[PDB]
Amino acid sequence: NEITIGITVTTTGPAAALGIPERNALEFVAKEIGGHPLKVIVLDDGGDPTAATTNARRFVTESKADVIMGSSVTPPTVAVSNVANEAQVPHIALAPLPITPERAKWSVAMPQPIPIMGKVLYEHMKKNNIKTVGYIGYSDSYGDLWFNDLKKQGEAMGLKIVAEERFARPDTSVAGQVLKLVAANPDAILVGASGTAAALPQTSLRERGYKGLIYQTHGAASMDFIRIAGKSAEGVLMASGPVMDPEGQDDSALTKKPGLELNTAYEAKYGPNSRSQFAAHSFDAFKVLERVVPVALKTAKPGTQEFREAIRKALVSEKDIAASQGVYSFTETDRYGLDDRSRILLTVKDGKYVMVK
Fold it and tell me: Which residues does 300 contact at the CB level (< 8 Å), separation at least 6?
């Protein structure tokens, strides 16, 4: 019999920049584990926490999913995590989320934790003698995480935050906010945003004569940003998973071969430079499944609560799961499980991503 996996990701609207590659990458992941076929149900949630919740409730109660995953952006991901921790179903998040005790038991997260990504950003800042920084980010939980980290790790690195501004995901101008940022004239701005919307502050800043450095989060790491921000993208510094550049990893790097293996297949189909931060999350989720699922199969059969529980326990017992974005070791309190083998710094030169470090 089948192992059932329910995935809710955004394939419509502008957050589809993140969910469409996560969905596309399912073509290349395992098809069966321990001789059981994978039944993989994927449903669009349009980026909406209400829709993600409904999809998750359906997966968990009607399809009797063994594992759920999603979503593509933080707020629907919090929602799925809440369903999962209540229904008692293993959940692999495909976007960062704040891990509270309510969420920690049943959810793990594939994306690098914000502070690991911020460190690479702030280190580049210090080395370049940047001191004043301004922030523009989402007025939701992803914007908060990145602002909380700038305030905390960022100030701990000797930076002074001079301005904080926020905008909503669907906003089409940040005119008023950018004028406040430009006025404070900071040495650098951090943009706490992602895909399509990450390019809004990028273009708006340059068009209003901002002269400083602009830094972007791993939420921005796909071609869609470059496509939209055009020349405004040039010289940006962006945090990224190492899947954006497996070619430049050393041959001993555990992430090298799966990164190459994902990217070769994905770019074979979708065109040159079509790789992303985002395709690699669903790919990596299935690499974790390839490790913990045969462990769970020792003590329970698919389709049961005993099977859900056994996967839960396997997630915390199996160390060093090599994937394209890092080497994952989850624990009962660390639901991200990643260290520094899981980040690089990109910039954009001539409409292309180049690895800085």
Answer: 306, 307, 309, 310
| CB count in 10 Å sphere of residue 40 | 18
Both tokens of residue 262?
A: 């994902």
DSSP 216: E
Report the candidate in 81, 32, 24 with the shortest Cα–Cα distance to residue 52: 81
Q: Residue type for 175, please?
A: A
Cis peptide before 107, with omega less than 30 degrees from 0?
Answer: no
CA angle 169, 170, 173 (to 5 degrees): 100
- Determine which helix (DSSP H) or strand (DSSP E) holds 100, and give its type and residue range: none
Resolution of the coordinates in A? 2.1
- Are 107 and 85 contacting, i.e. CB atoms less than 8 angstroms apart? yes
CB 267 within 8 A of CB 275: yes
Query: CB-hemisphere CA count at 13 Å for 194?
Result: 27
**Dist. CA 285–CA 274, nearest whole Å:** 20
Pull the structure tokens for residue 82. 């809440």
Tell me which amino acid residue 325 is: Q
| Exposure string for 44-76, b = 16+ CB within 10 A, e = fewer | bbbbbbebbbbbbebbbeeebbbbbbbbbbbbb
Cα distance between residue 238 and residue 155, in whole Å: 19
Instruction: Enumerate domains of the chain plus CATH numbers.
Output: 1-113+241-341 (3.40.50.2300), 114-240+342-357 (3.40.50.2300)
- Structure-determination technique: X-ray
Q: How far is CA 327 from CA 12, 245, 290, 337, in A?
A: 31, 16, 14, 8
Could you give the C-alpha distances from 74 to 135, 166, 213, 334, in angstroms and in order?
A: 19, 16, 26, 18
Residue 287 CB coordination number (10 Å): 20
Alpha-carbon distances of 219 from 10, 129, 230, 278, rounded to whole Å: 14, 25, 17, 8
Taking the alpha carbons at both ends of the chain, their separation in whole angstroms is 46
Q: Which two tokens stand for residue 165?
A: 């501004």
Q: Is 348 left (phi over 0), alpha (psi -120 to 50) or beta?
A: beta
